[PDB]
Amino acid sequence: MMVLVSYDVSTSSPGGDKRLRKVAKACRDLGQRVQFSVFEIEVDPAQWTALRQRLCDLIDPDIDSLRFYHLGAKWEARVEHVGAKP
Amino acid sequence: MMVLVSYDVSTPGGDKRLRKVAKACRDLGQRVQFSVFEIEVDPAQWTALRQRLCDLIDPDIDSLRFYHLGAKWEARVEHVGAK
């Protein structure tokens, strides 16, 4: 299944850089970092459960947010990219 | 239809560009994170908004990604953390 993970990391508090680094590292083997703070994760349900717990644990929920969107299969979302591909 | 719009904006003039993108989306959706918008548009409205978004960003250094979330997308989104 595809889960889209959007991480809104604080810029007005310390350590946001490190937290994003750790979130990105946790997503590295199960997905693609498609924008600075957005990850497309290709996972079965158990892999998602495991990864989700790590992501929740790695952020600071007082100042960061995660949104998780269950997309079904990537082709169903008819994804479009406009602009840069760093 | 629900289109999720994720704007990856470069960190000069970027603040202004994010503000203009948010303003263009304001009547057609919800800004659910700093640079992510849940946009509810019919196809004609999407054609119009999408063109505006393309014109408002700097495609050399910014990006947009658009996702069609489908019906009953509300049952398939989880929020964790600050709001």
Residue numbers in the entry:
A (entry chain A): 1 to 86
B (entry chain B): 1 to 11, 14 to 85
Give the exact sentences the study uses for this entry:
Cas2 is a universal Cas protein found in all types of CRISPR-Cas systems, and plays a role in new spacer acquisition during the adaptation stage of CRISPR-Cas immunity. In this study, we describe the structural and functional characterization of Xanthomonas albilineans Cas2 (XaCas2) of a subtype I-C CRISPR-Cas system and provide experimental evidence of pH-dependent conformational switching involving a hinge-bending motion during activation of the dsDNA nuclease function. Overall, the structural features of XaCas2 were similar to those of other subtype I-C Cas2 structures, including the protomer fold, the dimer interface, and the conformational state. The XaCas2 protomer contained an N-terminal ferredoxin fold consisting of a four-stranded antiparallel β-sheet (β1–4) and two α-helices (α1, α2), and a C-terminal segment including a 310-helix (η1) and a β-strand (β5) [Fig. 1(a)]. Although activity was observed under neutral and basic conditions, no dsDNA cleavage was detected at pH 6.0, consistent with the suggestion that the XaCas2 structure crystallized under acidic conditions was in a catalytically inactive conformation. Together, the functional and structural analyses indicate that XaCas2 is a metal- and pH-dependent non-specific dsDNA nuclease, and support the hypothesis that subtype I-C Cas2 proteins undergo a pH-dependent conformational change to allow metal-binding prior to catalysis.
The crystal structures of XaCas2 were determined to resolutions of 1.65 Å and 1.75 Å at 20 and 4 °C, respectively. Data collection and refinement statistics are summarized in Table I. The root mean square deviation (RMSD) of the Cα atomic positions between the two XaCas2 structures was only 0.07 Å, indicating that the two structures were essentially identical. In our crystal structure, XaCas2 seemed to adopt a catalytically inactive conformational state, as was also true of several other subtype I-C Cas2 structures evaluated previously. The crystal structure of the XaCas2 dimer exhibited structural heterogeneity in the putative hinge regions between the two protomers. As the electron densities were well defined and the B factors were relatively low, the two distinct hinge structures of XaCas2 probably represent two stable conformational states, which can be alternatively adopted via movement of the hinge region residues.
